Amino acid sequence: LVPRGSMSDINLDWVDRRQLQRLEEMLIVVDENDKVIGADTKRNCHLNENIEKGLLHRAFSVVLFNTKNRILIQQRSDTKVTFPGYFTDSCSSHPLYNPAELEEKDAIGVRRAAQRRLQAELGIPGEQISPEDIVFMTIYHHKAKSDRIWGEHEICYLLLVRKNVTLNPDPSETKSILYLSQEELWELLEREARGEVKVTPWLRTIAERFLYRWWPHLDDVTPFVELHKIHRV
Ligand SMILES: [Ca+2]
Ligand SMILES: [Mn+2]
């Protein structure tokens, strides 16, 4: 049984109606080797009480760069269930349990989900970024807590896009956007480490493990693609 100190455990008063409705999306539950074992809701997949029992889902993170090699850093809206108000990567979300997004060859299901969410969150039309533009790079397995009740536990596909795009972001999803140079991203993380700014834990991981390596090479990142690999971070 899950102990409940009080009914404050069930509080989602900061979350808007749209984000509450999205808690019912059916996600792809996987094992530690990224094999599909079933479906479960966004709500269930992001409860620490379930994550601690091993519940794990497939997800993605996108790093989007313009042609001046600035990265798009989202600030999550204050209405997100997890990490509200935090600065983070360009787009994170999950493929859904449906035929189109379950498709595994060349990670097309995940890349379709990424297009879908770049459109939904940032208002980037499909004409500007299609799945062909979204490059599969590698996979990382991570766990984080947003608060005592909610958190993350993902086999997370790291995807890269380098394109100039237009934005019409959904304020339900996104509070603000920064386009940072590599130097400015390093500075953001230095400030995070002092306590100045809230940043999702996986952004530091992606930056220090991958982005600094890749940045001088954004014109062709194909050497850095890792198949048959899951980083445990
Ligand atoms: Ca998201
Ligand atoms: Mn997740």
Swiss-Prot record:
Residue positions binding substrate: K42, R76, K80, S93
Pinpoint motif Microbody targeting signal by residue range: 231-233
Activity's dependence on pH: Optimum pH is 8.0.
Q: Which residues bind Mg(2+)?
A: H46, H57, E152, E154
Q: In which pathway does it act?
A: Isoprenoid biosynthesis; dimethylallyl diphosphate biosynthesis; dimethylallyl diphosphate from isopentenyl diphosphate: step 1/1
What catalytic activity does the UniProt entry give for this protein? isopentenyl diphosphate = dimethylallyl diphosphate
Q: Which GO terms describe its molecular function?
A: isopentenyl-diphosphate delta-isomerase activity; metal ion binding
Q: Which cofactor does it need?
A: Mg(2+)
- Cofactor details (free text): Binds 1 Mg(2+) ion per subunit.
Can you say where in the cell this protein is located? Peroxisome
The record places domain Nudix hydrolase at: 55-205
Keyword line: Cholesterol biosynthesis, Cholesterol metabolism, Isomerase, Isoprene biosynthesis, Lipid biosynthesis, Lipid metabolism, Magnesium, Metal-binding, Peroxisome, Steroid biosynthesis, Steroid metabolism, Sterol biosynthesis, Sterol metabolism
GO cellular component terms attached to this protein's record? cytoplasm; cytosol; intracellular membrane-bounded organelle; peroxisome
- Which InterPro entries does the UniProt record give? IsopentenylPP_isomerase_typ1 (IPR011876), NUDIX_hydrolase-like_dom_sf (IPR015797), NUDIX_hydrolase_dom (IPR000086)
Q: Where is the signal peptide?
A: none
Q: Which catalytic residues are annotated? A: S92, E154
Q: List the EC numbers from the record.
A: 5.3.3.2
| Annotated family | Belongs to the IPP isomerase type 1 family.
This chain's protein is named Isopentenyl-diphosphate delta-isomerase 2
Species per Swiss-Prot/TrEMBL record: Homo sapiens
